[PDB]
Design a protein around this ligand. Structure first.
Ligand SMILES: Cc1cc2nc3c(=O)[nH]c(=O)nc-3n(C[C@H](O)[C@H](O)[C@H](O)COP(=O)(O)O)c2cc1C
Ligand SMILES: Cc1cc2nc3c(=O)[nH]c(=O)nc-3n(C[C@H](O)[C@H](O)[C@H](O)COP(=O)(O)O)c2cc1C
Ligand SMILES: CCCCCCCc1cc(O)c2ccccc2[n+]1[O-]
Ligand SMILES: CCCCCCCc1cc(O)c2ccccc2[n+]1[O-]
Ligand SMILES: O=C(O)c1cc(=O)[nH]c(=O)[nH]1
Ligand SMILES: O=C(O)c1cc(=O)[nH]c(=O)[nH]1
Lengths: 335, 335
């Protein structure tokens, strides 16, 4: 039962608990010892972005940032796994402590800052995996890269992962790399998307492989901001949009431990906002391109709320922490 | 641990689980066995409709229709308890099976139809209770009473319960008595509200105290209908609005067992609709009378989402069935 494992894990500091569990997952992933974490879940194929997803539930980015546990996590039943965020060069992220639990609110605050081993390392791990689901690779900009030259970072990552990725995710919604969210505003977004779309075509002719590209947005976008962001995605024929990353909002966690920590709020306190963001976005997009819904999904009803607001697929992260593998089985079985 | 209790009770059909549970509650009342139900909760006093509530969390109507376990349920930490619905004359309600569990959705469907022992009996039960929180007494129309004369029934009950109620809840939102929901439309509502306020006025003069009246509305109302209901509640000086009852919607429960069962849906499948109803009603009311929020509250954040949409108090029914007494402590502690 996950309640017992969680009580134990929750004795440990958030980031420490993660490093221990993933040490253990590393040592079993891709080995017959993944029967320890294997869950049988039904098939629920979904066509999306020109790919078949074996089921509608993906693991959102940030949990396996370096691509170390693809097979073990696939063994728990995810229909897609989004690894990353990976930056062209490794970088340590922001100073610890940078990860905080809000246990009563079943939410998380984090200011990781893209802590990853770099895109070259990620490709080596992906080469070793045998996951039959859809693999998405999330990419972002090195901390030290000028925001006016962010495109250059997204394009080197694209060249190195194109051959091994089912889909590519463009993270421009972390609040933990300064200025990064500006890349979703006006001319900056247009230039970045034009570069990404041109490289995707180039790469498609090079490797002879269709790889869709989806942009991950933030939930703190204003209505005019959202409107402009939807229009740009359609105008540049982006293949899909991942809505939504973490929030700088703290309106539902006041008076709670760690609510004043800086960073992104995830989990149940993000659920409602992300659903409203997807509704509004779906109304603007009008079926022109699909949405992958992410934001406090912690039950099959919450997953279905995102479907009803317009999402074609869904991803979970914080609900996996607070409810465990069983959430995967619940959501895949009944969505 | 409630999960064990739930697994046992869920071996019974929902109506039998309930009456088996309530037999044991009536039996442990006033014995040292009442401590198995007793839960110490933090005091969070809140003033609303001119009453002081122990804490913001109440038990919604329909769990104790005859007022038989006021003491045992109070001991569990509720800051208020709403009994009913009760009708002037006893009536059996609709045919069994009339109550259904949707376990993976943590929802319920019911078509009880105001099965109750009558207002005189509830009054005798209230006289024997010792609860020190706010007692709400929820009243309704007998099935046989014609819809156009529904007000007669509300007035008969108001007279028999005025000396005993902390507040009175007028139920015009059950989907399970034919035409009852038309009493929240147009002239019917205006007529009902006038007769009720005049009875209130007469009864204050007779008993020398003001007992506030709250009207319970439905989540299936349109925007225009909700604007009219709010305007009528303000023009008639109603002391509060209870939003929201069960839903005829099945959009989030498709493909699930008991989903085609006729009646009202409660639980997690109603949460979002209830919240959106409260937000809209709150804009229309602009603070002129309080909202008691109800519908799918199963967590501290879900209760807080209702407060944010404009409610002053919240109530739970289905979440108490699915998550148990620990939910009372969780919400009252961190709301
Ligand atoms: C600790 C942590 C690390 C994350 N890292 C990433 C990341 O590297 N890239 C990304 O696009 N999203 C990342 N996310 C966000 C995810 C998801 O977009 C967001 O948390 C909402 O989903 P959730 O409420 O289910 O957690 C991270 C979230 C958390 C809590
Ligand atoms: C079995 C059952 C019986 C109910 N009986 C009543 C009732 O008699 N009067 C009333 O006003 N509401 C009644 N309700 C509705 C609840 O009081 C509440 O308004 C609705 O269920 C939404 O709350 P919830 O999602 O927390 O259960 C009943 C609900 C259920 C599930
Ligand atoms: C091994 C079954 C799945 C559980 C993985 C738990 C590892 C884990 C545990 C936590 O408490 C975390 C808190 C915040 C962010 C991430 C966390 N992770 O990744
Ligand atoms: C003492 C535990 C608190 C929960 C009460 C359990 C009894 C109980 C169990 C159920 O499965 C029900 C299903 C629908 C409606 C009411 C129900 N009740 O009242
Ligand atoms: O790693 C991070 O800092 C990070 C990236 C991202 O996209 N979202 C987030 O909340 N944190
Ligand atoms: O008893 C019922 O049928 C009933 C009454 C009411 O007010 N609401 C509801 O959902 N059911």
């Amino acid at each position: 039962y996950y309640p017992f494992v969680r009580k134990a894990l929750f004795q440990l500091d958030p980031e420490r608990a993660h490093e221990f569990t993933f040490q253990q997952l590393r040592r079993i992933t891709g080995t017959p010892f993944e029967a320890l974490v294997r869950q049988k879940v039904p098939a629920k194929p979904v066509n999306c972005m020109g790919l078949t997803f074996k089921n509608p539930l993906g693991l959102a980015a940030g949990l396996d940032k370096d691509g170390e546990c693809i097979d073990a996590l696939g063994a728990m039943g995810f229909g897609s796994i989004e690894i990353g965020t990976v930056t062209p060069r490794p970088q340590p992220g922001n100073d610890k402590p940078r990860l905080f639990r809000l246990v009563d609110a079943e939410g998380l605050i984090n200011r990781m800052g893209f802590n990853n081993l770099g895109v070259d390392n990620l490709v080596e791990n992906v080469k070793k995996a045998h996951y039959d689901g859809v693999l998405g690779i999330n990419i972002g900009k090195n901390k030290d890269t000028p925001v006016e030259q962010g495109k250059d970072d997204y394009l080197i990552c694209m060249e190195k992962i194109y051959a091994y990725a089912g889909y590519i995710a463009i993270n421009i919604s972390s609040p933990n790399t300064p200025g990064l969210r500006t890349l979703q505003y006006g001319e900056a977004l247009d230039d970045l998307l034009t570069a990404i779309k041109n490289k995707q075509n180039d790469l498609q002719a090079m490797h002879h492989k269709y790889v869709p590209i989806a942009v991950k947005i933030a939930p703190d976008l204003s209505e005019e901001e959202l409107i402009q962001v939807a229009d740009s995605l359609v105008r540049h024929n982006i293949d899909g949009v991942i809505a939504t990353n973490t929030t700088l909002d703290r309106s539902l966690v006041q008076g709670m431990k760690n609510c004043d920590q800086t960073g992104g709020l995830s989990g149940r306190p993000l659920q409602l906002k992300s659903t409203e963001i997807i509704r509004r976005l779906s109304l603007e997009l009008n079926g022109r391109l699909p949405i992958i819904g992410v934001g406090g999904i912690d039950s099959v009803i919450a997953a279905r709320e995102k479907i009803a607001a317009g999402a074609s697929l869904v991803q979970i992260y914080s609900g996996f922490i607070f409810k465990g593998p069983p959430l995967i089985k619940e959501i895949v079985t009944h969505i």
